[PDB]
């Protein structure tokens, strides 16, 4: 048969380890690692989750070189909790005048079709988002967020985010 | 049999049908009480 050659994520080619050992969910959701560029993969073999209500997230900054209002942003994730902390996952967009460490009080949420199974979650999707600052002198951040009424547990997995501002080339034997 | 044995193929493209009737007009057929457009 033929090969598909069309996808929805297109990861980064370089992955980074999480420099942290614990997180505390809160309404001001903490950022796991410092945001960077327009593409980033984060994997963690062991993360301790403390009891708390709220969430936590992994985000990237938006590139504003191209003057186009609406752009596509992709995600691919795979998380495994030891317990079953009934939770929902979404895509969050927010703005900040400096480098953020938590989530501000003004933000938007978006639905993405994942594969909840109880402790397990997988997704590979794309969503169109308005990427321009919408308010002068601000940066825009887009992240992958997990929210629940958390208890003490543990998790492992990886998260990857990508902003479609350029196209990736690949080898096609017939073309 | 009798008298035909002709042929009918033509070249070109099958243009859409234009007008249901009309090859040669005779007398009037319809009377409504005036003109109607």
């Amino acid at each position: 048969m033929f090969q598909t050659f069309i996808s929805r994520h297109n990861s980064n080619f370089f992955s980074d380890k999480l420099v942290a050992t614990s997180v505390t969910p809160a309404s001001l959701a903490p950022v796991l690692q410092t945001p960077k560029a327009a593409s980033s993969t984060l994997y963690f073999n062991q993360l301790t989750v403390n009891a708390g209500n709220g969430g936590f997230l992994h985000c990237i900054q938006m590139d504003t070189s191209v003057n186009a209002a609406n752009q596509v942003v992709s995600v691919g994730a795979d998380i495994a909790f030891d317990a079953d902390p009934k939770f929902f996952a979404c895509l969050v967009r927010f703005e900040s005048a400096s480098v953020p460490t938590t989530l501000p009080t003004d933000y938007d949420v978006y639905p993405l079709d994942g594969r909840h199974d109880g402790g397990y979650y997988t997704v590979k999707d794309c969503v169109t988002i308005d990427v321009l600052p919408r308010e002068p002198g601000n940066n825009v951040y887009v992240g992958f967020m997990v929210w629940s009424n958390f208890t003490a547990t543990k998790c492992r997995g990886l998260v990857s985010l990508n902003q479609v501002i350029k196209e990736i080339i690949c080898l096609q034997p017939l073309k | 049999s009798k008298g035909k044995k002709r042929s009918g193929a033509r070249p070109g493209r099958p243009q859409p049908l234009r007008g249901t009737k009309g090859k040669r007009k005779g007398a009037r057929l319809w009377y409504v009480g005036g003109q109607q457009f």
């Binding site: 033929f2 | 009798k2 002709r6 042929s7 193929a9 493209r13 099958p14």
Partner: protein, 53 residues
């Protein structure tokens, strides 16, 4: 047929004598057309015929 028997003697029969329809005209032709080429990933190299005469 009866009209065939009379014809062999050299005679003729009208269609009223035989009670048969009268053929007024007959036409015949061959039907032609062309092909359409497929252009996507799976149908590149496939053709479909269209007869119109």
């Amino acid at each position: 047929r009866y009209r065939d028997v009379i014809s062999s003697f050299g005679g003729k029969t009208s269609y009223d004598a035989d009670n048969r329809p009268l053929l007024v005209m007959r036409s015949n032709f061959w039907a032609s057309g062309y092909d359409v080429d497929g252009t996507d990933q799976t149908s590149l190299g496939q053709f479909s015929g269209r007869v119109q005469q």
